[PDB]
Design a protein around this ligand. Structure first.
Ligand SMILES: O[C@@H]1[C@@H](O)[C@H](O[C@@H]2CO[C@@H](O)[C@H](O)[C@H]2O)OC[C@H]1O
Ligand SMILES: O[C@@H]1[C@@H](O)[C@H](O[C@@H]2CO[C@@H](O)[C@H](O)[C@H]2O)OC[C@H]1O
Ligand SMILES: O[C@@H]1[C@@H](O)[C@@H](O)OC[C@H]1O
Ligand SMILES: O[C@@H]1[C@@H](O)[C@H](O)OC[C@H]1O
Ligand SMILES: [Ca+2]
Ligand code: NA
Length: 330
């Protein structure tokens, strides 16, 4: 049956989260996390998010029937990965499809790996090792209009980004949150140009600067605006839009810049807080309309780790601003 007309769950037979939506072959393909009721201990490092595989979803229209293409990748087949298949993304280049995924390696360190298919629906064969120089979580692989592909990534707290300032992992006993210096600039998300073959980074990883409207860095203490997780990049009318989750303040916000690397100027809220702790999204143009894919914990009766993806129309104004969406109003 058709789904996605009035912010209802897109699928109900499985729990789904962290939707990355793309238009491939004239269809919407969605690459979400597959939540399961693992019953794992709940804590601020996210051990309760104990996902083990990915299913690719697709829609021919919005609203439309949602097709579940089965298991696209299983953690047991990823040689380097020990646990926790977190928020993924996909990209398409030269008739190959690449699934990018964060997972903990055997030393309990989040890394980002790639898996390869000849179809947007998968299934995907994982590379034996993670991407060299990757770390932390929540990849978004963005194809610019010039044909260059960039990976945006990172997440603080359980995502471990705060343990990666020196090019070496700071360790299990290092900060569980951030820099713990609230008057210093907040930690920024990471970016790297992708290699031609889409399996590696083409440059040393860079940090993205996010600034306020006056050009001042967003500070570590500014939890309403500072980067937490779920980076996403889209382009509209020549402007680059870095959107992301603020985590403990539960917003999707956005910041604008003139190139992939920023700096990005904080503009405002994309999505207000949902049911359940996490907030995670993507923004995609399909048939000349823009859509916000997101999730909440409505289907599970409010369990933070059992989510369902949803979609709604997103409105850009011609001045580049985006209308804030509140999830439970209309
Ligand atoms: O030190 C402990 C780690 O060993 C543990 O990390 C897990 C080990 O098994 C691997 O298969 C997983 O990838 C990895 O996360 O986490 C708990 C910590 O106390
Ligand atoms: O890495 C992130 C975790 O740090 C995050 O943990 C949340 C912190 O606040 C607690 O009240 C929540 O229960 C807990 O989920 O979860 C999201 C994950 O990406
Ligand atoms: O990596 C994902 C993160 O962005 C958040 O949503 O919680 C854990 C995962 O779902
Ligand atoms: O957002 C800006 C704020 O960070 C600064 O402190 O005062 C001016 C505001 O526009
Ligand atoms: Ca994402
Ligand atoms: Na707004």
């Amino acid at each position: 049956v058709p789904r996605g007309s009035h912010m209802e769950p897109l699928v109900t037979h499985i729990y789904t989260a962290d939707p990355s939506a793309h238009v491939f072959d004239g269809k919407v393909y969605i690459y979400p996390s597959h939540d399961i009721d693992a019953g794992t201990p709940e804590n601020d490092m996210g051990d309760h998010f104990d996902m083990r595989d990915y299913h690719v979803l697709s829609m021919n229209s919005i609203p439309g029937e949602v097709t579940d293409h089965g298991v696209a990748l299983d953690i047991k087949d990823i040689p380097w990965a020990g646990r926790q298949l977190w928020a993924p993304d996909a990209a398409s280049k030269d008739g190959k499809y690449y699934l990018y995924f964060p997972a903990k390696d055997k030393e309990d360190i989040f890394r980002i790996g790639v898996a390869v298919s000849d179809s947007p629906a998968g299934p995907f064969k994982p590379e034996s090792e993670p991407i060299k120089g990757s770390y932390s979580i929540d990849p978004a692989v963005f194809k610019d209009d010039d044909g260059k592909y960039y990976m945006y990534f990172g997440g603080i707290w359980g995502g471990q980004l705060q343990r990666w300032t020196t090019g070496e992992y700071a360790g299990h006993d290092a900060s569980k949150t951030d820099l713990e210096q609230d008057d210093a600039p907040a930690i920024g998300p990471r970016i790297a140009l992708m290699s031609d073959d889409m399996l590696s980074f083409a440059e040393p990883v860079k940090e993205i600067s996010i600034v306020d409207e006056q050009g001042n860095p967003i500070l570590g203490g500014d939890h309403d605006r500072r980067f937490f997780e779920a980076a996403w990049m889209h382009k509209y009318n020549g402007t680059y839009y870095l959107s992301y989750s603020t985590g403990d303040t539960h917003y999707i916000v956005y910041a604008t810049g003139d190139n992939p690397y920023g700096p990005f100027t904080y503009r405002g809220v994309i999505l207000n807080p949902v049911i359940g702790w996490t907030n995670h999204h993507s923004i995609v143009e399909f048939n000349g309309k823009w859509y916000l894919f997101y999730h909440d914990s409505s289907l599970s009766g409010g369990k933070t780790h059992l989510r369902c993806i949803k979609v709604t129309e997103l409105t850009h104004n011609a001045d580049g601003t985006i209308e804030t969406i509140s999830p439970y109003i209309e």
